[PDB]
Nucleic acid binder design. Structure first.
Lengths: 95, 104, 81, 93, 92, 106, 79, 96
DNA sequence: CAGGATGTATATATCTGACACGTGCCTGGAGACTAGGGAGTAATCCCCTTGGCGGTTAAAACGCGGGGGACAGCGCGTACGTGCGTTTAAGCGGTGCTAGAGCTGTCTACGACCAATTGAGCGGCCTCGGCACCGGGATTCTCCA
DNA sequence: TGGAGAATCCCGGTGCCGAGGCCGCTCAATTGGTCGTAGACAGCTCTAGCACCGCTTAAACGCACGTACGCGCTGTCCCCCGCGTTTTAACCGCCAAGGGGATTACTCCCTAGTCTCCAGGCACGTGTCAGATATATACATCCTG
């Protein structure tokens, strides 16, 4: 009857995309979901305060761009901004 | 036709944009920000499972135990730097023995 | 009163010691580690009770345990759901 | 008996395994008594009391990492209680 | 239009120490501490309202955010001070 | 007519009310909360300033400069545990020298 | 030559602030190592923080939030 | 002539009272500007922004230096050899 | 102990730029009035916490005995501390400009609010293969002679 | 040096339950529509941040050397490791009981939003005196005695 939201199938078929012959425990997906929620809250709060002290009412792509560059260590950061910019460009090229 | 289909991604953007509205981080959210939000967290889950999957073949087990994600972070300096203030439950500590402690 | 603070036992700090990589341990280590564990649990269950008291509940659940640790900069995974 | 053989044996099998060290009910009967100081007639969820347990040892096995570094800095292999008085003052509490 | 907290803490200082002065550099120490403990207890109250799916901030709810963030003796005296400051407010 | 005079403090309710509104902490906030929050900074300002004037008194200086606020936070054991994560500009350090360094037979 | 702008009696002045009677000679190149890492990690964050405001002077305002992200929030110059 | 180490504690009680900023200012002007221009080109600095950096950096140094002081006392030694500094970063968690 | 030799604390003369107070305009605080939804209250039900009891057996507790590390002391070699002269450029004061932050004002595209349409997503239930467990044998290796 | 026993690794089967995946159901995502306002853009203003230039002046820099302090050697002693024995109580699994969390339902106040007006807080400006500095004095240290 209740509704509890989860990213279980999301990380499940992400793992089936990268390693299609590997299984995952439900406990392991619980660390996966908690870690994902933690980094989500971190990047969203960083972008929120970065938009707040810039007197801006909107989080565009540039705010979360600079917040990702703030929160992530160097080579992982540059790979992440490259791939996310690729995804953003692919989104705006299509309808 | 979901927004993740036109982005070509696999994490949903309609979920992420939903908690960007009622999440009170700001009252107005731009269009590309939840798309950019979904894309970054595509990497951060996939960075773990290939490291967990590499350690899965090292132990030769076709299931991922909470041991495996513990060594998927702690053996990498770029991942230990970010995840230094958080413990992982029932994963233990990677084996490390100091050289002066060793005999002979 | 009772033996609750020394309910943890002489091999119990021994087992956590070998996971912590030491070679030789002392006998007067032991009652101090009970104080250190208590004073860390003094600061943690204080925050979990105050979250329980705000939520109009008299049972401390699994989640408000976690954000007491997230307050302390010692956040935990696997029980945030 | 074997001198030093079982000393280096337990440290390898504990840094490899995942099994818990802090015993359940003497931890479970302790957490009721400290919560009794604050509020009377308290209830605890089964996952709640368990979540404190590996919260506690993961501090302590991280704390025992620090006291081991203190022991070698004094050119010794035995840990005195002043090593715990060392690392807590160094790391900020 | 650079606004600050310059006048308010000056009235507090003349209330307790009516023959003492405070430098402008000490003012910026005093202003920035208040601004940090603006957003600290307000920030912890900001999350905790969401944490039990409650969208309205009450005077009862911010009370708990005081008791989390400051230690023992100062925590007990601040809640008892603010309660008598607010019970006389609702009577008038 | 002033809301602070109806509450009897010094930090104004309305300035606190609009910043806790515009600082997007929640969609719906109450009216008693900006009353109460201004009081908890009032007690915190009363605590720091009492030790500040105490530090000004024994240094025989009638102007409070950031050295005395450093004396005001470091000496009391409690509020260092609140805010010892915070550095102070132009504050200085605690006078503290360990006794094992000090020479004997003097 | 500009890297050596931190000067050797001033390292003693931090060390004589340290309350220690004797200082070894290999401290001075060591503390250049550990402190130049530290101020690197503060303008790693503050410079791109300045870049976000379409802004090409690092003011005293934007830096204070950068150490607050690192966790050593500082007083005296606003914030 | 003074016995060596006694004017070290005589210089202590001057430095305990003082709050004046320790290392020189415009030597610190050059050293933070050279790594900034090496980071991104054409970067300027407000004068109080570098004044936000010195008491950020002397606060790192002397809070580390009392911290390795009580570490070096634990070795029953007065001189700080650099293996304390690697340990102080190790215990605080900033390095490993 | 101990006299002398200085580094630190004291003391008033003074002086200057920050500090406390005054004007007034002006923009946010406050009073008023309506709307409608967040939450107060309450009733129910069902997880789920607590309690208990007894067989089992893994593990705690204690004692004893030795062998190896803690530490006190020693001895030596050397690495800075105090001092003095030497070289450097820190820092102050002044001019100047010019690059860029802030202000101002008009606009338009983008995101907020809303109705409907429905397929992604989810709780539950069935199924079987991976994996831990029981048991037996090969493989090291460190202490004993 | 060998040898013998204590532990570790692995191999074969197995029974179990935890992952996995389908199945019917539903609620938030999506599509289509509008409106205004937040951000973007561009042009002007003026403040501040580089930026050379001399001056004098504390402070850095190099050298010297003695001494006490850092590092290796070593003997002792007891305390801590390490086994065997006895003791302790933990673990699973069985059943009872109810307590309070979570859900559904109903209304009402009280805060969000507009409208309107009023004063207290903030930019500018002022004049003054507190502590920074300064140079002579006590005093309370330490050094060779």
């Amino acid at each position: 009857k209740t509704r509890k939201e989860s990213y279980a199938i999301y990380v499940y078929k992400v793992l089936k995309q990268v390693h299609p012959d590997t299984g995952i425990s439900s406990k392991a997906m619980s660390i996966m979901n908690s870690f994902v929620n933690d980094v989500f809250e971190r990047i969203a709060g960083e972008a929120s305060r970065l938009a707040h002290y810039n007197k801006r009412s909107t989080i565009t792509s540039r705010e979360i761009q600079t917040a990702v560059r703030l929160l992530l260590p160097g080579e992982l950061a540059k790979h992440a901004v490259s791939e996310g910019t690729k995804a953003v460009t692919k989104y705006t090229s299509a309808k | 036709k979901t927004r993740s289909s036109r982005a070509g991604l696999q994490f949903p953007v309609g979920r992420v944009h939903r908690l960007l509205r009622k999440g009170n981080y700001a009252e107005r959210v731009g269009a590309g920000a939840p798309v950019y939000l979904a894309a970054v967290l595509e990497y951060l889950t996939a960075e773990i499972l290939e490291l967990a999957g590499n350690a899965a073949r090292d132990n030769k087990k076709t299931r991922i135990i909470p041991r495996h994600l513990q060594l998927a972070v702690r053996n990498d300096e770029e991942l230990n730097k970010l995840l230094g203030r958080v413990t992982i439950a029932q994963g233990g500590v990677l084996p490390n023995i100091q050289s002066v402690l060793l005999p002979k | 009163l009772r033996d609750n603070i020394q309910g943890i036992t002489k091999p119990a700090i021994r087992r956590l010691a070998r996971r912590g990589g030491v070679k030789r341990i002392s006998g007067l280590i032991y009652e101090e580690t009970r104080g250190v564990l208590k004073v860390f649990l003094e600061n943690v269950i204080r925050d979990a009770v105050t979250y329980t008291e705000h939520a109009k509940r008299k049972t401390v659940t699994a989640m408000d345990v976690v954000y007491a640790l997230k307050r302390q900069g010692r956040t935990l995974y696997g029980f945030g759901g | 008996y074997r001198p030093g053989t079982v000393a280096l044996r337990e440290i390898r099998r504990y840094q490899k395994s995942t099994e818990l060290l802090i015993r359940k009910l003497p931890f479970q009967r302790l957490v009721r008594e400290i919560a009794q100081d604050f509020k009377t007639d308290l209830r605890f969820q089964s996952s709640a009391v368990m979540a404190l347990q590996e919260a506690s040892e993961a501090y302590l096995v991280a704390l025992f990492e620090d006291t081991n570094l203190a022991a070698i800095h004094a050119k010794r292999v035995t840990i005195m209680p002043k090593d715990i008085q060392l690392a807590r003052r160094i790391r900020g509490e």
